[PDB]
Structure 1
Amino acid sequence: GSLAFLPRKRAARHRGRVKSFPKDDPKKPVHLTAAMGYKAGMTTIVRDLDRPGAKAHKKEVVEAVTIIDCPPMVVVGLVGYIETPRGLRSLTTVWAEHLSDEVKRRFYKNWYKSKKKAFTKYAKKYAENNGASITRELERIKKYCTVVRVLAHTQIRKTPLKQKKAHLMEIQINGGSVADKVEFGRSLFEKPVTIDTIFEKDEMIDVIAVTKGHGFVGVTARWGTKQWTVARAGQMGYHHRTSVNHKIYRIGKGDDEANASTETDLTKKKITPMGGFVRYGEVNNDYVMIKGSVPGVKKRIMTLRKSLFTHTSRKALEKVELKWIDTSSEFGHGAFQTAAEKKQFMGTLKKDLQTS
């Protein structure tokens, strides 16, 4: 196997970290650089290809795409960083008032019996003098910090998971003076940010998650055979992987009610498969359609971030046009996209006649 992923141990945290934000220049406009979502599953699409030089040019190609459910992240914080000879140091974290109970669940291991007193005194310094402690801490970021980040969390009630604990993550602001991005961060407090605003269609993005765990296995499957370099048994899976150059094929709204409808098939249907996603449920929010395979199991939190470098391929500058999206049953050999055309194909059944 590769010696680059040599410490084949379990990932230290379930969420998995970005480890590198894009290099920042002040001439760019102010923008965020990452987001979070939940893995729903995969489907099948047909894309009308426009690849000059390809054998499938101006033809129909069937591709596998991955659906990531993206409820709108809520911005709750702002973290400033300074440059050091020892590295990079966090100087000041500024939160907001009216923190939701979802992110408050994150700072507790037993929420059901706690007194829920987190950030109770922090809510009082917003009205202590006039907010002097809050404004002082922001001015400390403006005059001393070299780059600032945004604390945003996802909501689990919009997602069909039995979890109630939100996922809290730091997202870097790029493209501007430190004064400009701080005024973004304070203005963005208590506000939902959609995936329509962070990313866009036809864009390579970077996907970060923890892979599927397989427990203790031997050298037959852990290494792929017939000190560190010697193939030895141990843990396979639950490793942190950063994947590169995955195209955003679609960004659904969730309100639209015709998410799986294209300009060529005029069927008013959504992205959720007929019968539901297996072991996930229904996607009722914004979703991101990612081409190809993507790490992590279903229901797992997905971290999407911008590409670090300017792209060097025509695959990134390709406009994607979808002809149709599969919506048939994941639970078997489904030959029906919607409920309506199954009853149209089948005809009247016995239970339908007895009920009516």
Structure 2
Amino acid sequence: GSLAFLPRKRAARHRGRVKSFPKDDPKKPVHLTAAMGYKAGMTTIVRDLDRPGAKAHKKEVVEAVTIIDCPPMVVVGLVGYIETPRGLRSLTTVWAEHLSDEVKRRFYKNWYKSKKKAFTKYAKKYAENNGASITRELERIKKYCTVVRVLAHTQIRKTPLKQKKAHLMEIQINGGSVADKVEFGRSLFEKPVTIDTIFEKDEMIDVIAVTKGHGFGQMGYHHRTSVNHKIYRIGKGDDEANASTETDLTKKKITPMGGFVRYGEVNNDYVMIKGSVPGVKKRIMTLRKSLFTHTSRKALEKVELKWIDTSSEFGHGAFQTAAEKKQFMGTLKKDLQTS
């Protein structure tokens, strides 16, 4: 194979790390770089293609897309880094009040038998007029640091999973002075940030994941950073018509009939992204921005959807809604016996 990915080895961590944030300049506005989500599955769409010069121009093309459930992330920290002859060094970090039970479970390994004593002294530091110490750390980040990141964690309690341990990571703030970005993070403390705010529709981004193990030497469980994937839609979860387009007036959600196979139902903000993505269903995904400005027309295209498949994934299914199934079918022995 490729000597770039060889010696082949298991990923040291299940989450997957960014390893490179986009280069930052003060002129751009203040923004976050990356995000987290959980792979729910894949569905089929069609697109009123508007690609000039292509054989399928002004035609309808069937494409496969992937769904990543993206519950809002909670900001719980702010990390300040400095430049040294040995590289970047994490000078300091500042945590917030009221760390959630899920991020505390992330810190703990045996959470059930532990006395849950984490960050209690930090909370006392914040609340007991050691805000002088908190502001001292903040001003140290203000005047000594060059690149600033925000600690953020997901909501497992909102993701329909048997897990209860959240995933914490650093998302870098770009586009501004160090003072502006530290103030931005301190303002973002104890607040949910949304995927429709970190990314938008029609934006080729990068997905970082760990490949599916192919065991029962190493095949799979390999850290990959797949680039250039066009986000096709950002769904609101509470819109009740996420899967609806302007061409079909069907009030339906992104979740297929009977639910996603082995994952469940997507009731949160979700991202519909073109193509395939590394990782199995319900695996943690990392969504970041492209390190460079794009060079293709495919990046500037506008995706006009026509309809989204909500048929059953558990087999050869053919009805988008239970209402459609019962209209096609009529009434049954069970329905008349119950009624």
How high is the TM-score relative to the length of structure 1?
A: 0.95
2:328 alignment partner, SS class:
helix
**Residues 1-356 of structure 1 aligned to structure 2 (within 5 Å):** 1-129=1-129, 131-215=131-215, 234-356=217-339
Output the CA distance in 1 between the equivalents of 2:130 and 2:171: 28
**Cα distance in 2 for residues equivalent to 1:2 and 1:13:** 22
- Please state whether the residue corresponding to 1:61 is helix, strand or coil: strand
Tell me by how many angstroms 1:61 deviates. 0.2
- CA apart distance, 1:215: 2.0
| Stretches (4+) displaced over 2 A | 127-130
In 1, distance between residues paired with 2:338 and 2:100? 46
Of Structure 1 and Structure 2, which has the larger fraction of its residues in helix? 2
SS at match of 1:66: strand
How far apart are the structure 2 equivalents of 1:291 and 1:346?
Answer: 34
- How far does residue 126 in structure 1 lie from its aligned partner after superposition? 1.1
Instruction: State the Cα deviation string for residues 214-240 of structure 1 (Å, max 9, x = none).
Output: 127xxxxxxxxxxxxxxxxx1100000
Deviates further, 160-169 or 125-134? 125-134
Deviation, structure 1 residue 125: 1.0
1:96-126 deviation digits (Å, cap 9, x = unpaired): 0011110000111100011000000000111
The alpha carbon displacement at 1:43 in A equals 0.2
Question: What whole-Å deviation, never above 9, does each CA across 1:236-276 have from its counterpart, x for those lacking one?
Answer: 00000000000000000011000000000000000000011
Deviation string 1:303-351 (CA, Å, 9 cap, x unpaired) is 0000000000000000000000000000000010000010111111000
Secondary structure of 1:114's counterpart equals coil
Q: CA deviation at 1:211?
A: 0.3
Residues in 1 aligned to 2:194 and 2:124: alpha-carbon distance in whole angstroms: 29
Please state whether the residue corresponding to 1:151 is helix, strand or coil: strand
Q: CA deviation at 1:130?
A: 5.0
d(CA) in 1 for partners of 2:21, 2:335: 57
Shift of 1:170: 0.4
Per-residue CA deviations over 1:275-300 (Å, capped at 9, x if unaligned) read 11000000000000010000000010
1:229 is matched with none
SS in 2 for 1:181: helix
Report the Cα offset of residue 128 of structure 1: 2.6
- Structure 1 residues 172-228: Cα deviation after superposition (integer angstroms, max 9, x where no partner): 000000000000010000000010100010000000000000127xxxxxxxxxxxx
2:210 and 2:278 mapped to 1: Cα distance? 7
Query: For structure 2, which runs of at least 5 residues remain unmatched after alignment?
Result: none
TM-score, scaled relative to structure 2: 0.99
Secondary structure of the residue aligned to 2:134 is: helix
Q: Secondary structure at the match of 1:180?
A: helix
CA distance in 2, matches of 1:129, 1:174: 31
Question: What is the deviation of 1:40?
Answer: 0.1
Aligned Cα root-mean-square deviation (Å): 0.7
Cα distance per residue 1:6-65 (max 9 Å; x no partner):
120100000010000000000000000000000000000010000000000000000000
SS of the equivalent of 2:201 reads: coil
Measured after TM superposition, the shift of residue 127 of structure 1 is 2.6
- Worse-superposed segment, 49-58 or 119-128: 119-128
Q: How many equivalent pairs are there?
A: 339
Q: Distance in 2 between matches of 1:271 and 1:106?
A: 29
What is the CA–CA distance in structure 2 between the aligned matches of 1:128 and 1:178, rounded to whole Å?
Answer: 28
Q: Which secondary structure does the structure 2 equivalent of 1:315 belong to?
A: helix
